[PDB]
Amino acid sequence: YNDGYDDDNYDYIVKNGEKWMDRYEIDSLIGKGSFGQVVKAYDRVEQEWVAIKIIKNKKAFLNQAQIEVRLLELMNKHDTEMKYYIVHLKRHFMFRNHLCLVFEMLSYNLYDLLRNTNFRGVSLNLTRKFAQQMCTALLFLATPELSIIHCDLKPENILLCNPKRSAIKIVDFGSSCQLGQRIYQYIQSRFYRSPEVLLGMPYDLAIDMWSLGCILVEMHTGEPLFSGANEVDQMNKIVEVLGIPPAHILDQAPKARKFFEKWNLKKTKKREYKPPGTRKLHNILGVETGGPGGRRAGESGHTVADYLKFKDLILRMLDYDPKTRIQPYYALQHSFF
Template identity: 50%
Template sequence: NHGYDDEKYDYIAVPGEEFGGRYEIHATIGTGSFSKVYRARDLRDGALVALKVVKSKAIFMAQAQAEVELLARLLQEDPEGVFNCTRLLDSFWHRGHQCLVFELLSCSLYEHLSEHEFEGLRLPVLRQMARQILKALAFLAHPDVDIIHADLKPENVLLRSRHGTSLQVIDFGSSCFGTRRMHTYIQSRFYRSPEIVLGIPYSRAIDMWSLGCMLVELHTGEPLFPA
């Protein structure tokens, strides 16, 4: 990609670099199989945002286009973000990379567990978090939304603040519409449902399986099904 990428197809971003004529890169805050996420500043209003830069490999770019379509549906059906799902603020291309802009949140539930030495959450706190995730899943199951998340795990649920319990479900990169299942090898292994393991048809019930595994882990500090 004209020297802009490393050997893994990730864009080589430089602190202070401007993306989309609007966002100034500050630092890397996350790295995944398909993308990197940066803390950036919106030059229009000074707000800090999370800027996701997808790898330039064709298969990842196609998946990113599908994610943008899913996120557009979420934004259309929940413009104020009351159902605890991440909101796409902007999307654009930068030197051959699909870029997505989101609200900057705090730590993931996995990071929260790690910071507390995996002692597990107290039940009252866990109930508050579970209600919010269930609200998100109920929203995704609505006929007008009809999305299977397909990668629900502690790393993909972020707190708005390190000192609160308000949260958002993020990362719809493996998701699909219920009527348009795109992938067969999905879900992270600790949270992978029997349907996916056996390679049989699946539904949004796989998200409930993942949630059950998550809740046990968040309470005990250990994965329910380590593999």
Template identity: 45%
Template sequence: MMVDGPSAKHAQRTSGFRRVRDQRDLRPNVNPQPAGRRIDSDGNFLSPLRQLTTNLVDTYHICNPQFRYESTHNPRRVLTKPSKPVHNDGYDNEDYDYILYVNDWLGTEEGHKYLILDVLGQGTFGQVVKCQNMKTHEVVAVKVVKNKPAYFNQSMMEVTILELLNNQCDPNDEHHILRLHDSFIHRNHLCLVFELLSSNLYELIKQNQFQGLSTQLVKVFAAQLLDALTVLKEARLIHCDLKPENILLKSLSSPQIKVIDFGSACHERQTVYTYIQSRFYRSPEVLLGNPYTAAIDMWSLGCIVVELFLGLPLFPGTSEYNQITRIVDMLGMPPQYMLELGKQTNQFFDSYADMYGNKKYRLKSIEQYSREHNTQEQPGKQYFKHNTLPDIINNAPIHPYKSSSSRASSHEVDKEMANRASFIDFCMGLLNLNPLERWTPQQARGHPFITGEKWTGPWKVRPI
């Protein structure tokens, strides 16, 4: 055997290497643990690094048996922006928002106290923070309302409505309506304590790359929303701001949902506000300035279920004029009585006499509307290749995740197209321009798309 030569000499000079003869030479060398080193609850020896980091609290306790860790002693990270004290003896910022810190607390010594953990969201009404009930240790969401009379009064109405819904209309928490746990005043701010929920449906659409959900999953969500809206309808309440952001999953592991944010809700006899509903989900009667009823929530529901299926909003108006233009382009003109009653009709439509002397209306051109309102209206972006709702839904791609295999079989395609035919009919009942003919939640719940009955053709609504 040759032992001389450059490679052999190099091997002899290289320290730290040894010849591998069999598997025994591949076994690791495990150094014995130094004497006196602590072990954790799993029986593993702790390195000095771990004793001074992840196990620091135990290390302190060994050094001082009197030591007890309290999260309230942690540094307080500010959660509110801007955070400069301006109003309310320095407790509020310039926007009258309460300046919130991590590990600060909300509540009173006599009542419930809530330890602030993190911020969940911010809006015109105020802020929502994740908190822990210091008595029960339950983690909740707390809405901290701005220190302004208008927001305070509106939020007190929200408390009244939720107490009615939770205690009388849905005492067993069966109808997908947000639960209010507590309410109190903290340094002039009304605070509402809610159950903690998960992501909203807009975030779900976004996580799915705006490709839309299956008809089956849309049906599951629609059935729950109709259940909630039935309870509201029977209580003669209107949500007034139904949209994907106000529908939350209970958890990421289940399609169970809850309707939230009753801050704009009202009783059918108290429809005093005219500027309601988020624009994409705003009903024709509200756009035209007509009196409105709970039917406006059903219009919003129609917009939501189509958006869940397509992944994109059906009427993404850039202004009220653009909104009504999109609706008219897809669904046609509103009924004559709505145009004649509407306080805002003349903003968007011109009236003229036809050849028989009858009064008619036509939508103003973009140039005319811009000139009259001193704006620069732009044609809205077109998200869809087709113009009618049936064509848009039928031509949406059948994604692999909408069928059981990577390529849908002809049987699955036929089944999907039958589901879509039923879905189109369901949506058209919700998106009826005439609120007097638009389906109520009780009627819509009987549609084959919701019940799962075989689709045989246009559904005749049953009077309620």
């Protein structure tokens, strides 16, 4: 396959030590996925470590990577500090029938940070810092000339700049798309999938806000707020916390009849899900019990008022209505910040 450089799945065989164009010294394989591979390599010209997204030698993967490159260059064309919360595309080029996207090498993802803790979560102050940076990034994406939906926000796609610092950068704009050029349903990761996407509705930049809500809850608690194994299971675990969705939008839900009957839920058979709205965030966060696991009792920034502000912000971010769901700017003005 491809003179011995590619293989099955159209993936470039990564040989640790190979040099590219007398510039890039391929160190190792740091990641794999549909798109192809990511390699850690050394830019000898700029003398710095970079990540290289090597896209598969299939046509559609190339076209998707080209959409991503155009979105990233469009983000590079807007001069504001907010853009510094997005991973920076350093270069793109074609090498041996593979589109390669050079990126800054960052530290570990937020799921790795959750795993460093014994999935006990991180402090609400670190959650506050992460949330501020994420809302600023989503504000940058909300710029009308951009109007970009990330379409796959998850802890694995939020990386740390330095492992000692609290700065973060969101990565993986492969599934991303502009507000106009939406090209696919089944867009987001299940745990962080917005309701409108589950209901087959025209989605927009609010699905990222939903994902961010679930992500912040998971960051503080250490566990996914909505750990659904399938679509209907995810929707049911959502309703467990947020009740039945506003019919005003279910009267417009193509996939409404997949979860609800005209408006109430569907029988299981089977242990029933917790009645709608009974699983309050209040108890998940532990607003009056010292936080998740009673470990944050008496800690600064972890008072009952701080937990209540966090609960309000999360609920504002988990709004069923995409039009009333909090926008990044007003999310930044929340009392939690």
